Symmetry: C3
Subunit: 71 residues, 3 copies
Amino acid sequence: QKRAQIQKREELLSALIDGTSRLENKQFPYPGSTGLDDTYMNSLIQYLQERKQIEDKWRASLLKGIQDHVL
Amino acid sequence: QKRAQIQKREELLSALIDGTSRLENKQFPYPGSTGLDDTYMNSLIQYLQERKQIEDKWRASLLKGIQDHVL
Amino acid sequence: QKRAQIQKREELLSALIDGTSRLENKQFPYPGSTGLDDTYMNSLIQYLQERKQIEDKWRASLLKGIQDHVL
């Protein structure tokens, strides 16, 4: 049914919008006056680690949408 | 109209091709003989910061294409 | 033909599944008790360098799929 096929298309768009928005709204951490200190480097690493998770969910969501013929 | 629906499909493909090509053609900076010096680390950080921007535009373009039924 | 159009849709899905799975299954390297030592920083850099390659192939595969009307 579309009952399912709209559940799928809705799921997908909501997931992709959520993902896209959270990814793009995150500020990239660039060093300030303290340079490449331990605080800075942690912030960079934590940024990359979080971004991985959200990117990975985003691609997975897209692929599922492609597999399920939702787009 | 397709006047719009081709404007949309054309926009999209051009944007995605531009993005894809700029992302893939960028060389990943790996340390050389000077190791993890301040020059190297800046080059890595600037690479990541730029790549974020282009990746974020690319995903946004794709999502818009999905939302507008252009693909 | 679909002979080609299924070759294309099959190629694509297999490529995207391969890519997605390899990206998401890779553990993000976060520093341990030794901190930001040269071993750690190499592991981070090698992670990013590999991830670039696989991400870039994944996007290229997707775009080709969009261009060839396979999805």
